[PDB]
């Protein structure tokens, strides 16, 4: 197995507690395993003290539930207690000109409620996290954050882009900048932005949206110091994705070599936040080497931002055939194309012609890759490319994944693509006939697997990329389809909220007004990128007073 980034003593000790808890509880009422890895040490006790008592308490071959809860109450501060509520300095309950293009007053007022939830998601690490970080798995960060919500008690990487799009609508550019400052601090420390700001995430990244967050903020604020600070960190992240295990080389039929990226977690064990579920998932493998490959493919699917999906399974829907490190993903390489486009822009506005030139050349190269490696004329969409081996290889047609995913349409987001009329029409036709267009939005896949990144679910980021892309074209049919999807998506979210008073992580887009589920954890509410896409969609499209419920 390739590189592994070690975790901390605290995390491996909290995994011990986690194992004891799940062994001691009944299956019917077991707590969210991740909440044990989110504990912190209760002052004044040291790790050495607490572990010593834990060794004594478990010095018998199960621990009674009552004794375990007493122990956890005694020596730890609960999950989330070191993540304090923070009032955003830029939050305003009813901003002047907020969603002024929304004529339907019922829509506008519900959107103000959604906007109001930014307060709920706004947090800051406690002083103890900064003073003595070794007592927390929550990492210290320089600025307040926006979290996804519920069990996600920490900032996440790619979520923050769609959060920022909503923050812009919400007139919260100080909070928006704070997110990017926090993610830039992680790149500076680790070399990449972590999956999330927890010690058990230092081994991997997530879809690389940081350059897009910096671009969207600067495009409004013209904060020149931000771009000056961002450029070397974006260059560092760019090298991270274009080197080592993340870099792959695919030669096409005309013999041109294409440099592309894959996901690759630097981890080959159970994820500490899911330790027992991951062990259970791997229980059928006979050899430790098989377990390690699988655990790395699992952690790599977490790096994809899309854990989990038939998309990453060699033999779907068999979860044990997860093979994420073998996939050259469409959406990942869209984001790297976007990085090249953003970095060329920033280097131009900062006055660096040579750097701008270098990244125009790069984006031009990856544009070629999309036309040759990913595109499929017959399917009218872009397909993930599955590696033949681990070493450069030659493109084979049978290695495109012909299965149908919302991510297959991610490249429509890119301007060189959505500016191409005759390409856009082919993609429109493919999307219309794909079966991904459902009553509430775009299905993330067509296979009902039991996993959350599969049918019947749809997901805010994937809606936004397709809607923005189609909506940027000049093709009337694309623009009308984009608006229709946006309004179905808004409506379903409005209907879910009337029943639950919450915004959900994912929707069951096969049915209007239903939230989605699946996967190893219960449906979560908040919800960062879901709120952001609702607000961004309403800003773009408004809601005419005549159209309604």
UniProtKB/Swiss-Prot annotation:
Key word Endoplasmic reticulum present: no
Q: What is its EC number?
A: 3.2.1.28
Q: What general EC class does the enzyme of this chain belong to? A: hydrolase
- Identify the keywords attached in UniProt to this record, alphabetized: Cell membrane, Cytoplasm, Glycosidase, Hydrolase, Membrane, Nucleus, Stress response, Transmembrane, Transmembrane helix
Instruction: Give me the residues that bind alpha,alpha-trehalose, please.
Output: 151, 159, 195, 204, 206, 271, 273, 505, 520
Q: Which PROSITE patterns match?
A: LIPOCALIN, TREHALASE_2
KO phenotype (gene knockout): No visible phenotype under normal growth conditions, but plants accumulate high levels of trehalose and starch. Elevated trehalose contents and drought-susceptible phenotype.
GO terms for biological process? trehalose catabolic process
Q: In which tissues is it expressed?
A: Highly expressed in flowers. Expressed at low levels in leaves and stems. Expressed in guard cells.
Q: Name one GO molecular function term.
A: alpha,alpha-trehalase activity
Query: What positions does UniProt annotate as the active site of this protein?
Result: 307 (proton donor/acceptor), 505 (proton donor/acceptor)
UniProt keyword Oxidoreductase, yes or no: no
- Could you describe the subunit structure of this protein? Forms homodimers.
Record's miscellaneous remark: Plants overexpressing TRE1 exhibit increased tolerance to drought stress.
Protein function: Involved in the regulation of trehalose content by hydrolyzing trehalose to glucose. May play a role in the regulation of abscisic acid-induced stomatal closure in response to drought stress.
**Protein name per the record:** Trehalase
Organism (species): Arabidopsis thaliana
Q: What is the lineage of its organism?
A: Eukaryota, Viridiplantae, Streptophyta, Embryophyta, Tracheophyta
UniProt gene name = TRE1
